[model samples]
Target: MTRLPDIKKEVRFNAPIEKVWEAVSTSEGLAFWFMENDLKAETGHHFHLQSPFGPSPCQVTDVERPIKLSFTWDTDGWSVTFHLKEEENGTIFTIVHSGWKQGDTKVEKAGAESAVVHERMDRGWHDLVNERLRQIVE
Candidate 1:
């Protein structure tokens, strides 16, 4: 089986680990930055996020408290992970988004030379992580 290329981005917050955790793991935290969601960090929990494209279903795949939180986004159904490392001064936040479908003809026709879904998500995650998400923290 071929593996799909994953979208990964990292951000460093000059805030405490606990502050970073609240933003990365809780529904309220997500809403302030990412989306308005009813998401809970419990495994097997199902939720949805309000996106510009509309509401997309999502599920909690894993949770490790102040360190990691993972979920599945049904808009193309990709696996999204948020990992946090507590640093001496603040925290390092990294996002690993994977499980994208590599070759959908419909997406290719739209002018994305590569996997359309992956391309779209790549940009989306970049802005969400490096810009929007970081904006709240910084």
Candidate 2:
């Protein structure tokens, strides 16, 4: 077993990895599901990602075309990783957004004053990947 749990979540999508890769990898498809502007998947490349009301620069940590991707996503108190995997006929995406020594200093660090936005963003992840993006491919 892995030594850390660290808030890992995975979901298998009933769609091709190429489709999933497009949605999560390129700037265009990601604009449809999540953020806007020039996000990309080239290894070692960095770009600005839209936040709630601003932008933050994020970088690609590792990538293997449409098969796999990992990014060093840092905005809150701790750095997070987004891992994507390809299946024969589908795709699996995993989120690892925890590595903080402090429990309360997880996602809530984005806005220490509240959890309302974090709650909404959590729902947004689900809605974006499972609802909007699913409909886009289907």
Candidate 3:
């Protein structure tokens, strides 16, 4: 099986790790920046994110308060993971969107389709993290 690429984005917030954790782990916080969601900070909990694209079904895969949080994203096998690190002055938040693939498509078409998806998501992540998320957290 050929592996696909992952979209990784990072940002530093002038807030504590606990604040950053709440921003990503809770539904209200997420709705402020990312999307309207029903997320719970517990593994195996199922939820959905009401995104502009659509309602994306997701399930929490891991949750470690103020440190790490991850979940399945959408109908595909793709997943999103958030890692928070405390610095002397602030918290470093990293988003890793992984497991992108073009399901049941030809090799030629797969590459093109995957590239489009990656590009859109890359831009979306940047806007969410740098603009929306930053404004509320910092």
Best model number under TM-score:
3
Residue-level lDDT of model 1, residues 1-138, one tens digit each, is: 465678888877688877768787788888888788987678889888887766788888888787878988765555789898998767888989876554544443234644665777688878788768777777
Summarize candidate 2's per-residue lDDT along 1-138 as a digit string, tens digits.
433335555666788777877777788887786667576778888877776756677777776676556665556544545666777757777765554443333344555422344445556655666667776566
Reference-based lDDT, residue 16, model 2: 78
The clash number for model 2 is 0
Which 10-residue window in model 3 sums to the lowest lDDT? Answer: 103-112
| Global lDDT scores for all candidate models | 0.76, 0.64, 0.78
* TM-score per candidate: 0.81, 0.69, 0.84
> Residue 72 of candidate 2: its Cα lDDT?
55
The C-alpha RMSD in Å for every predicted model, in order, reads 2.9, 4.0, 3.4
User: Which residue pairs show collisions in model 3?
Assistant: none
Report the C-alpha lDDT of model 3 over 118-138, residue by residue, as the tens digit: 777789987788778977776
Per-residue error for 65 in candidate 3, Å, reads 1.0
Show the lowest summed lDDT stretch of 10 residues, model 2.
Answer: 99-108
Clashing pairs in 2: none
